[PDB]
Amino acid sequence: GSHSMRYFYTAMSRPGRGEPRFIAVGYVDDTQFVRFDSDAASPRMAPRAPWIEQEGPEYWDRNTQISKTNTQTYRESLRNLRGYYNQSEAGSHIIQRMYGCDVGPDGRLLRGYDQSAYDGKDYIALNEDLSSWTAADTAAQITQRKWEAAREAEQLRAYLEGLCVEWLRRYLENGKETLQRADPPKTHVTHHPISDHEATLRCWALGFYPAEITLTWQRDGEDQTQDTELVETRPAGDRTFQKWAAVVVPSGEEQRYTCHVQHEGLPKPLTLRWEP
């Protein structure tokens, strides 16, 4: 179906321990494909997925130079935001930025993104129109005025409607055997006694891609959302993800409970129950 490309920038100052570190990672959907780290012995944009390795030297030199320039620009930005908040030179602060594009099954732009945070709180974001800004506070208004004066939103729009979708479509074709393959979850239900009164039913989903999934427990066909313990979806390390959902059930009432699994890799949604 639809697909996304995202870059994630983290710039971290560390007074007394050198200049701020700049890290950039790129994703297509839930697959990381590049990384940059200014702390590396020799900083370079580096491949993290096999299908990006076929890009030629011009690609790697160009993205490396952009990342090296960003290392300097984000150091400037950290100095600026420290001033906008009247903060001392002694503390460590973080700028985070996420930007990129979503495309539909036909490759057309669905929406573009550019959002920033300072010390973990929203700072400034490009609106969905790709032409105006939302600033969180009076400090971010300074950045907004600077970016309005520079017509930076127009530069974001040009990138998001152009290069972003063009290269995302290229990546999707070059990595089509993985990026356009959905792997269904392997599922099972476990039973963990608690006492003579109750036991835990746990519904497992393993080895699925992409990370998007729905795992729910029902009792007599009614969703048990408030009573279900739902662990955060977690990476297996082999590109796939894992998740489980658990509910505490009265002894002997186990058959009133069903686990429902929805995932893009599945021919049809699954309904599972405990099988003693």
């Binding site: 790129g26 960003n70 600026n80 920033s116 400034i124 600077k146 520079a150 530069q155 974001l156 972003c164």
Partner: peptide, 9 residues
């Protein structure tokens, strides 16, 4: 592909 020529904050 990264966006080039970012303006500082």
């Amino acid at each position: 592909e990264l966006r080039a020529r970012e303006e500082a904050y």
